Amino acid sequence: MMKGYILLEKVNIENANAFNNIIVGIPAITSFLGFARALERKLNAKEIAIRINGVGLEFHEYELKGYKNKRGQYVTSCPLPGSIPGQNEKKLDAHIMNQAYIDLNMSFLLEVEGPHVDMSTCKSIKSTMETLRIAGGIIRNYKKIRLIDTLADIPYGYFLTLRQDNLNDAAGDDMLDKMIHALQQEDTLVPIAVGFKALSEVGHVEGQRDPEKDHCFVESIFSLGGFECSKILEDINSCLWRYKTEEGLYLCTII
Amino acid sequence: QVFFPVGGSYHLLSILPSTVLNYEVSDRLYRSKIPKIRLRLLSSNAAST
DNA sequence: TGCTAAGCGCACCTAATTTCCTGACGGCAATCCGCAC
DNA sequence: GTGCGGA
RNA sequence: UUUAGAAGGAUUGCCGUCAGGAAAUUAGGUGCGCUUAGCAGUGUACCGCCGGAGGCGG
Numbered sequence: 582m583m584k585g586y587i588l589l590e591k592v593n594i595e596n597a598n599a600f601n602n603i604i605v606g607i608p609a610i611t612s613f614l615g616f617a618r619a620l621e622r623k624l625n626a627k628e629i630a631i632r633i634n635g636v637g638l639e640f641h642e643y644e645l646k647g648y649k650n651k652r653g654q655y656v657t658s659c660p661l662p663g664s665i666p667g668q669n670e671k672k673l674d675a676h677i678m679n680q681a682y683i684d685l686n687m688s689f690l691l692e693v694e695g696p697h698v699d700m701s702t703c704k705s706i707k708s709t710m711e712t713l714r715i716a717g718g719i720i721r722n723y724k725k726i727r728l729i730d731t732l733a734d735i736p737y738g739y740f741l742t743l744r745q746d747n748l749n750d751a752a753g754d755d756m757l758d759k760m761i762h763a764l765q766q767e768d769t770l771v772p773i774a775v776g777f778k779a780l781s782e783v784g785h786v787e788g789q790r791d792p793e794k795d796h797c798f799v800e801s802i803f804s805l806g807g808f809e810c811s812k813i814l815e816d817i818n819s820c821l822w823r824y825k826t827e828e829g830l831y832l833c834t835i836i
Numbered sequence: 837q838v839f840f841p842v843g844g845s846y847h848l849l850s851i852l853p854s855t856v857l858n859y860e861v862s863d864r865l866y867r868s869k870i871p872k873i874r875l876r877l878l879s880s881n882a883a884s885t
Numbered sequence: 886t887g888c889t890a891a892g893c894g895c896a897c898c899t900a901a902t903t904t905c906c907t908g909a910c911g912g913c914a915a916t917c918c919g920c921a922c
Numbered sequence: 923g924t925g926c927g928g929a
Numbered sequence: 930u931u932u933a934g935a936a937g938g939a940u941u942g943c944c945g946u947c948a949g950g951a952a953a954u955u956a957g958g959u960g961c962g963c964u965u966a967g968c969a970g971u972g973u974a975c976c977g978c979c980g981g982a983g984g985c986g987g
Contacts, residue, residue, distance in 0.1 A: 598931090598932070600932075601932065602853045602854060602857070602858060602932080603857060603858065603861050605873045605875070608931090608932095609931085609932075611838075611840075611931065611932090612931040612932090613931075614931080615838075615839075615930075615931030616931055617931090618841065618930070618931080619930055619931065622930060623930090654872075654873070654874070655873050656876075657873070657875065657877075659877065659936095660936050660937085660938095661917090661936060661937060661938055662917075662935090662936055663935060663936035663937090664935080664936080665935075665936090666935095667919080668918095668919060668920075669918075669919075672917095673916090674916050674917050675917065675936085676882055676917060676918075676919095677877050677878070677879070677882070677916095677917050678877065678878070678882075679875055679877050679878060680877070681875075713931095714931075715931075716931065716932095717931075717932090717933075717934085757860065757861070757864065758864075761864060761865075761868060761870065764870045765868075765869070765870060774932090777840070777849060777851070780852065783847075789837070789848055790837045790848060790933080791848060791930095794846060794847065794848045795847050795848065796847075796848050796849075796850065797847060797848075797849055797850075798849075798850050798852060799849045799850065799851055799852070800851070800852060800854060801851065801932075824841060826840075826841075826842050826843065831840050831842075831847075831849070837932095837933070838930090838931070838932070838933065839930055839931085839933095846930080851932050853932085879917070879918085880928085880929065881917090881918045881919095881927095881928095882917085882918060882919090883928090883929075884918075884919095884927065884928055884929075885918055885919050885920090886969100886970085887968105887969095887970100889965095889966105890965100891963105892962105893962105895959100895960105896959105897957100897958105898956105898957105901953100901954105903951100903952105904950100904951105905950105907947100908946105908947105909945100910944105911944105913941095914940105914941105915939095915940105916938100917938105918926105918927105920925105920926095921924105921925100921926095922923100922924085922925095
């Protein structure tokens with residue numbers, strides 16, 4: 582019954598997950614969209630009807646936990662492991678698996694659709710964001726939660742957008758060769774993770790987190806992305822990530 | 837195990853990593869100039885496990 | 886509390902050659918493995 | 923509470 | 930309802946000895962800065978006076 586835009590401005594996230602089996606860097610888009618969905622689910626239990634249908638991701642600064650060597654390469658750092666459940670839980674030294682962590686400052690543009698979208702909604706989002714996480718990281722501080730109307734009320738930064746056309750129109754003989762060639766031609770693009778693909782059928786197995794839902798075994802899928810500034814942008818709708826679900830595919834796309 | 841919204845409800849998804857894809861990114865990046873990172877956290881005994 | 890309005894700021898040509906750039910010794914010890922018997 | 927088994 | 934949920938990297942330390950940068954030079958020709966104006970704005974406020982602080986006379 583009404584539609585608007587809410588901006589979450591300059592949020593500090595400390596120690597967010599940065600490993601997706603072929604990528605070390607920016608976290609996957611599904612974590613940010615799940616943060617938006619978790620905020621939606623927590624606002625609807627306080628009897629405040631709202632629906633978040635699109636999120637835009639803006640970047641201001643980053644820091645990867647580690648250091649840069651003299652040759653210009655990164656060496657990651659991980660915390661010291663503690664007690665882990667299993668057969669060797671009573672030991673003093675535990676195992677070291679594969680992990681990576683990142684630090685971010687970002688801003689979020691949320692498209693909300695509900696019966697009322699005033700500043701009391703902004704106060705409720707301010708009261709409901711001090712009990713949530715982004716990726717697996719904690720929120721130290723935010724600056725201000727406010728409503729926006731046009732492109733000129735947005736702070737300066739660089740947004741992330743999908744560039745699937747630059748991947749389907751390149752090289753050949755397999756998709757990974759297209760990925761490597763497209764990354765060698767234009768140097769301002771990054772590989773990102775954009776959702777999941779099925780590896781089995783839907784059913785019920787033993788050992789689930791919730792034993793009353795449907796279950797599928799999945800694999801992560803990867804695509805290409807790029808950065809555009811906030812003063813060279815056309816429309817709000819061309820930087821908003823949304824959910825899309827086919828049969829066997831769970832994705833995140835910019836229509 | 838994570839949740840994913842499918843049409844008014846949710847699906848529970850268990851993610852399994854790919855072993856063959858990890859072997860082919862590393863071979864095809866040893867002879868290339870795009871930025872890359874080497875992870876040196878897994879030992880020999882834990883790899884056999 | 887006031888302190889100007891207009892225009893413009895070159896055309897040429899060049900920027901050196903030689904010789905060489907060290908010999909030694911060394912660069913840590915500890916720990917980070919599930920599973921079937 | 924042991925010892926195996928690879929790169 | 931986020932590749933979910935958890936984590937102490939620690940202690941110690943002698944970089945040192947020696948030394949020749951060096952020789953030669955041509956920066957040169959030309960040239961219109963320039964038409965107008967009131968230091969004004971008011972150019973600054975003095976003695977008192979009772980009161981005791983607070984208020985009018987010249």
